[PDB]
Amino acid sequence: LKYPRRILDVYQILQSPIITEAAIKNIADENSLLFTVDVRADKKMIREAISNFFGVKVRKVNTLIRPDGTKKAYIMLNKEYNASELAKKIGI
Amino acid sequence: RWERKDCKPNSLPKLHKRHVKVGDTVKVISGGEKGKIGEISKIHKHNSTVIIKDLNFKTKHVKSKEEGEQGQIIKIEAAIHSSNVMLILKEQEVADRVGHKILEDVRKVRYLIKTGEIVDTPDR
Amino acid sequence: DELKELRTKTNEQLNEEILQLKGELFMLRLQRSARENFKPSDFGRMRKRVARMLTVKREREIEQGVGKRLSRKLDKAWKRSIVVRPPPSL
Amino acid sequence: RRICPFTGKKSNKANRVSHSNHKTKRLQFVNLQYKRVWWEAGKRFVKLRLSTKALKTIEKNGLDAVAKKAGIDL
RNA sequence: GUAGAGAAAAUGCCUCGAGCCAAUGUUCGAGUACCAGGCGCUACGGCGCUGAAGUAACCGAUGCCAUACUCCCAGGAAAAGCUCGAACGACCUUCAACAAAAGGGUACCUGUACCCGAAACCGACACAGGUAGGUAGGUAGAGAAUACCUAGGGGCGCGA
RNA sequence: AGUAACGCAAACAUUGGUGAGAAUCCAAUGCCCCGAAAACCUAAGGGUUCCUCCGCAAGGUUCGUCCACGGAGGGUGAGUCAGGGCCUAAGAUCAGGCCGAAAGGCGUAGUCGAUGGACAACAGGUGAAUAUUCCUGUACUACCCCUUGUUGGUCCCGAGG
RNA sequence: GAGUUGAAAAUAAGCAGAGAUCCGGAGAUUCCCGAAUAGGUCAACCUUUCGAACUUCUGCUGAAUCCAUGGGCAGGCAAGAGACAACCUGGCGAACUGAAACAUCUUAGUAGCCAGAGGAAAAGAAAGCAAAAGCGAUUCCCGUAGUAGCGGCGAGCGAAAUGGGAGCAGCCUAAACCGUGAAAACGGGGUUGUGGGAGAGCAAUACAAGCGUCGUGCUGCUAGGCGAAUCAGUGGAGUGCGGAACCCUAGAUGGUGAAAGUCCAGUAGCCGAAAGCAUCACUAGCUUAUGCUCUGACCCGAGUAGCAUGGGGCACGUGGAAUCCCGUGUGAAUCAGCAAGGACCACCUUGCAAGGCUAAAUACUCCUGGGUGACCGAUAGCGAAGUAGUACCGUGAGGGA
Secondary structure (H helix, E strand, O other): OOOOOOOOOOHHHEEEEOOOHHHHHHHHHHOEEEEEEOOOOOOHHHHOOOOOOOOOOEEEEEEEEOOOOOEEEEEEEOOOOOHHHHHHHHOO | OHHHOOOOOOOOOOOOOOOOOOOOEEEEOOOOOOOOEEEEEEEEOOOOEEEEOOOOOEEOOOOOOOOOOOOOOOEEOOOEEHHHEEEOOOOOOOOEOOOOEEOOOOOEEOOOOOOOOOOOOOOO | OOOOOOOOOOHHHHHHHHHHHHHHHHHHHHHHHOOOOOHHHHOHHHHHHHHHHHHHHHHHHHHHOOOHHHHHHHHHHHHOOOOOOOOOOO | OOOOOOOOOOOEEOOOEOOOOOEOOOEEOOOOEEEEEEEHHHOEEEEEEEOHHHHHHHHHHOOHHHHHHHOOOO
């Protein structure tokens, strides 16, 4: 049997996008976009909550703890999928 | 101001309980503007403070806009305590004390003690 | 206005209805970023509805008879395997 | 501990009076002692730790009685 | 290789056996970038396009061969990885492993800011104190001193 | 008593700015000082001081438009760098075992414990705050997927190292 | 029974008489560290085949002698492991001090530390006290008595019996002999005392008590409701003041612009519960013991009481030093016996050991509810009337506005 690094419920994994001008530049720059994940997340459980909630295959998940405790996840979407047009259905 | 915050039994503020109800037609009993009918509009149930309309005259001042433009004065009608309001009906135009009855149905309602009128009236 | 339907749902429909609830709630959270502000009216209800589902299931589990420890273990054997699904709304 | 398995013979709290009557504290303790008694019911020795009074007692009263009165074997 | 059974440990014979060891070296990586210098814009930063030569001799290391080597006595850590195989141990090409295409894809948590010969660290102060390690240029010099300077940084936070 | 002092004897000067206010902020031009450093990294420590925009009550031994001070937003991305997922030294804790008024002491196999051993990334770009983390190019390690074969395994084990 | 989404105001939409907010009984969830529990760990983390170790239960069954074993292995179930204000019991147990010094003694077996447990614990049903007269399990208060006594007869320590009250409550086992037995063991008789129990006979024993099965019914607790009676003038406001009414099983309290039975929430009195919990009672089961007598001579808590010796505590400091528990060694009898009656010996009187359990009166407060205060009211009262064990200080224990 295979278990997840931890039981976080999956849905609770992502919380909200980041609406800073820099993240807008990254959407328009790399096929990336930023999420704000709760602290017990992975590159497996974030890499496998976008390829199964937006229908887009993801390339990288560079995630980082943030000086106040919560976590922040740059995701690079594979080039074939283009960032801005995907964020447009999301509202960004 | 801590001396006057809402009082809290374990996460909540005690609500007191007042005879007056919203939409009530009251006479001011004693304080200040004694003897002036009114329609309550808004009950602050933790202090027993009740604003009845068009009576209490507070002349405040308000900075309106962000450039100092306008800021024309507003005249708000502020609180009055609950023990200073009795009930009146236009028919028995007279102050009274509240009461209670269990009418022929199950329900239980107000009953002005000095008259025969019913405070509860219809549900709406 | 009360939910006399969850007690009519069997286990499966109850369960997938839970997941769908959490999804649509994910979307509501998502909307806050782009400020479509109907949420306060009907955000908490969503949240405050999944709880009903969970409560109903536990009572059902209780008549049948399982210890809290056993129930906890059962929950983990279910939390462990679940795949996120897009919400029905598209 | 220094407590006989087969009787709660503890040490004794006793002050040693001197000749000027100067009382120290001098804990005073049993001569419980390493031996290896031959438990017949197994034809075999067991290694015990025995206040001699209890040793005398097993002999007078046999062993297994002492055993159950303290519940010790195996 | 064989002799006391795989494996070294010990024995003897022998091997188109004479070369093995390691930094440098060459080529690709880099027919590339990179670049001094040109011509315009500009709220005087910035960007734009172009863009030549890209080589040799000296000296030299307190990096590198390197636990080379010589000399010493006071005689210098362990256990995993990793390489060979016996009771060829449970298990067996269904669950296995190797040459292998060096072909295709995937790739776990935690730290990363800023100070760090310090005004923010330890001396209670924005304390003429202290704080492991790394890089080490020019002229004169034996030198990591000294003196004057590149790189870079500062003119010490009361003045007249 | 408005008295000593203003924290070393590197050293400031100008023009022009910003502003209600300039010796004290910004930009020039000049002078000057360190340069085995008064430079650039990095372990520890600090822990939000970093960046941007407002602010000047208190703080700064003067001043203040300025700050490491107040307010609001923002920021630190690793398969390869460091640690853990590998190993063990000093030491620690030690099942069972022994000993002891109680707590607890001694002690073996085990388990942790690196300051050490195994193990795989460099150059150039970008940009207000990150870059051996992002981008471009070329690399490397581990596990699968595909082919041919041999069927023979992996452990505990005994050895080299 | 209406308005509401905690503190302070919006903010955003909501919910509610097709019971919202809210108040009670019972539930459910209860991330991570912490006994901490899957393994490690710098706590709130990492690696995880997802789950301690100790009992217990069911199975495998090392060693030697395949014996028998215990140990080990596994699948089990889910009970012990932590916390505490003070009170309590136990173990260890000081010192400054008083003696105008100080070694016996006193502070004191106090403080503290460790170990348990309870709402109380410990003690407890007579091998007791007494004194020619009587008592009758324990535990406390009064009082005898600051007496008797002990004491470098120094400092000082200081009982008890009779007397009065609070509270009352008694039982279960070990033999002796009987029915089993892979010779351990279980079952039943047996438990009291100027001496009972093992032995011998009925006219079909009942009343009495305890407990439990679940079950029934009031009494209270955890929500709550109904609940009497007035206005005017004064002056920023009246509950005061002058005037004029009324209620009172309700002038207890808190508020309300300024103090009031008649303004409000209320109070006397009265009504009230799903459900949970309490203190009792009853309806049906087990269970209750001496209903009686007589003549034998069995057993009547075995390395224990004694003794020697070393002590501790007894109010009693080795003193004539009894009783009371302990270290070392010897080591009785049991009822034509044994222990106590302040060395010991006789006679008499009381009680009969070496097994166990047991409610109350009783000491306590981090606390909860009700009430009271010749108690404080802002350097007082809790250290703390706002993010008070906070800021701050110390490496740390700890200090602390």
